[PDB]
């Protein structure tokens, strides 16, 4: 069967600009390729079918081109409701194959993350739990690393990370890093720090506390 590969899984561009999404096939598919859009909420709708032809209801800003093994989806001017993941689908031969998918994201100025550390809740400790939560909100670009130091020693095990999608308003990102461990493991030390390494700073941002 044919392998459909979209060389770029992620793509950044400013609003109002022209964007293009490439879709390569392992073999020639004779312009038998369609494009789909999956909004962040999950809903999937058809945009372009048979390489160039637009579907009914699709804005005229969308267009498709390409032939042989290389095809492309092009938006004349990027709109806020166009921020989604786009999949290409061939139908020249069965079985039908979708592409890897390309997520569209908005470009903005770099922003330093606001780091906030939170010691285990008093209510959680009464149940034997002790999760140390560290918030890293509103930053750009997406790439960022977190390091957990406990009494000066780096903790790599037991770290739970979660990243949000690009913020709808200011186009920033946020991460939640939780150090999940029991009350016994928590009371074995006292110095819990949360280091944040980002593009915007040469020196990492540190947030810590003590059990004092």
């Amino acid at each position: 069967d044919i392998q459909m590969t979209q060389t770029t899984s992620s793509l950044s561009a400013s609003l109002g600009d022209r964007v293009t999404i490439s879709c390569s096939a392992s073999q020639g598919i004779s312009n038998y390729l369609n494009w789909y859009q999956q909004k962040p909420d999950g809903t999937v709708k058809l945009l372009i079918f048979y390489t160039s032809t637009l579907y009914s209801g699709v804005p005229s800003r969308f267009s498709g081109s390409g032939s042989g093994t290389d095809y492309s989806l092009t938006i004349s001017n990027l709109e806020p409701e166009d921020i989604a993941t786009y999949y290409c689908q061939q139908y020249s031969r069965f079985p039908y194959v979708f592409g890897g998918g390309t997520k569209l994201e908005i470009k903005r100025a770099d922003a330093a993350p606001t780091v906030s550390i939170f010691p285990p809740s008093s209510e959680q400790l009464t149940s034997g739990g002790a999760s140390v939560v560290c918030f890293l909100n509103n930053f750009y670009p997406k790439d960022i690393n977190v390091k957990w130091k406990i009494d000066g020693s780096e903790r790599q095990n037991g770290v739970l990370n979660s990243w949000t999608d690009q913020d709808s308003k200011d186009s920033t990102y946020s991460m939640s890093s939780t150090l999940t461990l029991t009350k016994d493991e928590y009371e074995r030390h006292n110095s819990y720090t949360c280091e944040a390494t980002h593009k915007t700073s040469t020196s990492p941002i540190v947030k810590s506390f003590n059990r004092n």
């Binding site: 079918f49 689908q89 906030s116 990370n161």
Partner: protein, 217 residues
């Protein structure tokens, strides 16, 4: 009026059987075939196959032969997806889409979430996150939602009256249970002046937990 309505979410144990329906309406059911698309959480779309609504003949892809089966009941205009001997890899959202000319998938369903896990239904433990005892123009609060099953859960701040400056992070799996957290950033003059309450509702266990964030001391 053309739409495809699937069944609700499913919770199955490894080895069990699941059946997903796909109600068709607004058009003559025997005029177009029905496709099935799989999407693992955090992954792309995978075309499973399609079934002819006249001959009742399925056409599977490479990695969907043996435990998968397409069926339909024309008298009710509904296509069925069935997966036997469920495995952990089957945990995904399954879409159904009406086939058309030019090999396009049109009028997609809302998708049916299938979760293969041995975990039982568990109510979330909601904990308030107050900052350390100490400065600054703004202050960030938090709310921890730990160990629940299954999805989804809804988290609001002050019953919705506090919407701006809120970051609710996607649920992350840990030992077959979900864990979620949320942060809210407000001015330093409004807290602890006003009350900031965390509202967490888990419909799977009929749980509605309110949790005020109290200062440490």
């Amino acid at each position: 009026q053309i739409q495809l309505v699937q069944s609700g979410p499913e919770l199955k144990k490894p080895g069990e059987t699941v059946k997903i329906s796909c109600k068709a309406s607004g058009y003559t059911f025997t005029n177009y075939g029905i496709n099935w698309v799989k999407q693992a959480p955090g992954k792309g779309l995978k075309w499973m196959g399609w079934i002819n609504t006249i001959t009742e003949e399925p056409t599977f892809a490479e990695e969907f032969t043996g435990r998968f089966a397409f069926s339909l009941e024309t008298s009710a205009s509904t296509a069925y997806l069935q997966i036997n001997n469920l495995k952990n890899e089957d945990t995904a959202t399954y879409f159904c889409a009406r086939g058309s000319e030019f090999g396009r998938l049109v009028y997609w369903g809302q998708g049916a979430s299938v979760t293969v896990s041995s975990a039982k239904t568990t109510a979330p433990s909601v904990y308030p996150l107050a900052p350390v005892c100490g400065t600054g123009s703004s202050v960030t609060l938090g709310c921890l939602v730990k160990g629940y099953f299954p999805e989804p859960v809804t988290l609001t701040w002050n019953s919705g009256s506090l919407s701006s400056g809120v970051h609710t992070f996607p649920a992350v799996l840990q030992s077959d249970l979900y864990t979620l957290s949320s942060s809210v950033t407000v001015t330093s003059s409004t807290w602890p002046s006003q009350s900031i309450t965390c509202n967490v509702a888990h419909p799977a266990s009929s749980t509605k937990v309110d949790k005020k964030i109290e200062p440490r001391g």
